[PDB]
């Protein structure tokens, strides 16, 4: 154990056990005209403003204080410093965790084993811009001799979600770039439906893989190459249509891609924190290197913000401690992410991986068995669509669900003189208001009175029209969703995730929970061949396998 | 509350911990050769097989019995009958709940107020086929004489998710049909990015809206019409490019649509159960009416299975009671849906709406305050992608998470001689095996011994490589994902949702938790105009609104 030993954690727990049930959001606001002023923070980045209103939360100044003492007591600051200074904090793998280095525009040296990392970081960044240029506008080589129209990124998990999410989110900066596609699933339908719309001679493939050994990626990659080599019969033309993002040059050249067309990153770059490195080649190819370097800066801005701001006003820290409050004290299993922005329709999913992959652990750094909750289940859907799909359970269900509502002040498409975005903003505002205020039995009763329902009817409907409210939310508004702000927003959460992991004393940059599936998978592959029944596994796995062999032939 | 007061419910609850012997999947399979045979059911639909393996669950024959007695004790069967017989079980709105009627291929009369519903159901179905055939054949032309290339459905929530999900899932049956798009969000970026790729004279718009008054839909509709009327200056040409699916003739005749271009459905058709009615026009337009009827037939099939199979072998019932077990006894907040199939990438989200908006209630039919958990938070992502994004927390996190793994035996794209689907199946099988088996401390150590780790390495690494397993899953395998099976699969869950709702004694066909947001929304819309600060709300809403007006025109 660890966290459960800490005194500040104990005090925070005892306080909740005793005064937690009385905390009312509706109450708080009427007895404190400054609640908003006291529980929010506006951030000027010089490239847009970011307001983080965390006032619609079940917290008092005393609560925020206990929460802050806890963050300090757990060594959040020292841990932060260890990360930025290049120390190997990813203990289990004895690696450094340096995604802040990939976006370190200041170029302040960061040393890993007596060698500053920035030179190799900028070396790669430069090479990306150089390649980007040659592709973006003619000049790059289609064995046929034509400029490349489509870029296909082939990768999974960390080598996929980030580039995809960011590219969908920054479409308004598509500007003269080629069309980018993203193939990840091993499921053959994925690459097949992508290759069906492509033209070999004008397509550029980017096999994105850190280890360059993942089964889904390499298989998808081999299928792309066989597809390409089908039209272009010369295996030497592969170097004109295939490039790679990885660390194992040996593996890369084995595939057929030459060493100079391999953009590299480093072991200290976690997969779920890789979009900022070479893995973001498709982003740069889509919105140009300027919009990319912009993305790189917004994070860097946040990186510095996180580093230099006292805890009481540190966004990532505040976001993280609020989560701990709801996770370790209230016991809430999930964290809802709701961006009222279509372009960000992949944002929530980006962080399911971001959060869950990092903090879905039960073993601390000392090897002690955790005896408290860790990472939450992160889910969500955008725009106003959720209001019609599942808000019903958020408002009147039986689960307490912390919600982060995000939205840009001005859209990329102010059509109809801004009427759409006006309605979008109103709902964004109204939902957290409703989630907080709710609607009492009397307010409801009074409404049914003015409706003309018979005492019979009114009673049978009254409680159903009652909103108990008191449902906590965070409102995150920013001037506009540009590459810089987006980069800032992503970094913000990355650090939220970091702070929680440090508080739980767990290694957020670990993915050991994935190897059991992979190995039992490799063991089953050959058993699927043939039609003889399998019996080596548990009855269920046997049954599933045999039902499969039986039905594989049916029509 | 008619549930916590139920005897069989209390027995089940006391049993859950009245004694140890605490369930452990690995132990139950180790000691019961008959587990798979005893806890699974294969369904032959004559149009493909559907195996539901629910053996990887924390349950014994005694548990399944107690769970079954409970379902009977809460009148699941009588409730079912009342639904099918057309009784107004949606009490709060005094409406019938008849989505089974929309797919009632047998045409067995269903009477609602002394009038059989089927005639009006088939009347509409026929009209859809008539319209569908005209647009696809090229008979229906824009007032330019050009055939129609793209179909744009404009709707939200129930008038959107179903058609979108099914259309993505049945792409292999696209066959000759137009390109179909789906605009829902009020967020202007959504329709704008869609209209930018369209050509007025060849585009057909389908304004899908039950009430035909929802703000997002009507606004998006008005924007489409203004966009169209931009190229085509004649307001009378609207009847050649706009059609409607509604129950509100008056408003439909107000927008500018033609009465005979209105395909109707009925108040007893819930929005989140509407894809089977006229709302599925875009599905029929995409895959033809034949496939559409195979879709309905599939559901009609599951309906009959639900209606005629004793509880002990009734899939929807077994799926529902397992959930109750994990929801009301173990206390699990979420239900994960994982389809190893790219085409079904919108499946989880569909039921995220179907489940959550149906059972996210806290008021029973008697008006009593629920004192037990209700509907779970439903989330999920497809293929093997999840294995790389969040399975880490499912395997080694601290949350118990019931998981439904779904997959077709044979794919629509057996490329590379079926190698991709082979790997896909192996992972599908291996994951539930791993989730069940896990890896003990000794097995793990025995691995680090083999690998040749140092006495230090193995030490600090041992715990982290341990999988405690015992994580329950359901495996749902089907011969192939065809319109019929898909239709069968959707119906199956619809009824699982029905059974749980009946057990909790709540009205699953209600959406009252929606109004508060809408009204507070309307109240804020006009306050956003102008630059004067708003002060009528709580400090937070005021702050958010004012930060907005402030940043509204910054550059
Ligand atoms: O880092 C992560 O979040 C996960 O480990 C995973 O998402 C990983 O990135 C890929 O499964 C492996 O792909 P690569 O071999 O390209 O790293
Ligand atoms: O059943 C539901 O889930 C709700 O009714 C919701 O999904 C509804 O479909 C939309 O809010 C649009 O409603 P209209 O179709 O009437 O415009």
Curated annotation (Swiss-Prot), chains A, B:
What species was this sequence derived from? Oryctolagus cuniculus (Rabbit)
Pathway this chain belongs to: Carbohydrate degradation; glycolysis; D-glyceraldehyde 3-phosphate and glycerone phosphate from D-glucose: step 2/4
Which residue positions are annotated as catalytic?
357, 388, 518
> For this UniProt entry, what is the primary localization, expressed as one broad class?
cytoplasm
Q: Which GO terms describe its molecular function?
A: carbohydrate derivative binding; cytokine activity; glucose-6-phosphate isomerase activity; monosaccharide binding
Posttranslational mods: Phosphorylation at Ser-184 by CK2 has been shown to decrease enzymatic activity and may contribute to secretion by a non-classical secretory pathway.
The record's subcellular location field reads: Cytoplasm; Secreted
Sites where the protein binds D-glucose 6-phosphate: 158-159, 209-214, 353, 357, 388, 518
- Specify whether Heme is a keyword of the entry: no
Indicate yes or no for the key word Magnesium: no
Spell out which residues are annotated as carrying N6-malonyllysine: 453
Q: Which residues carry this modification: Phosphothreonine?
A: 108, 249
One GO cellular-component annotation of the UniProt record comes to: extracellular space
Q: What Enzyme Commission number(s) does the record list for this chain?
A: 5.3.1.9
Where Phosphoserine occurs, residue numbers?
Answer: 106, 184, 454
Q: Which residues carry this modification: N6-succinyllysine?
A: 453
Keyword line: Acetylation, Cytokine, Cytoplasm, Gluconeogenesis, Glycolysis, Hydroxylation, Isomerase, Phosphoprotein, Secreted, Ubl conjugation
Instruction: Indicate what this protein is called per its UniProt record.
Output: Glucose-6-phosphate isomerase
Instruction: Describe the task this protein carries out.
Output: In the cytoplasm, catalyzes the conversion of glucose-6-phosphate to fructose-6-phosphate, the second step in glycolysis, and the reverse reaction during gluconeogenesis. Besides it's role as a glycolytic enzyme, also acts as a secreted cytokine: acts as an angiogenic factor (AMF) that stimulates endothelial cell motility. Acts as a neurotrophic factor, neuroleukin, for spinal and sensory neurons. It is secreted by lectin-stimulated T-cells and induces immunoglobulin secretion.
Query: What Gene3D superfamilies does the record tag this protein with?
Result: 1.10.1390.10, Glucose-6-phosphate isomerase like protein, domain 1
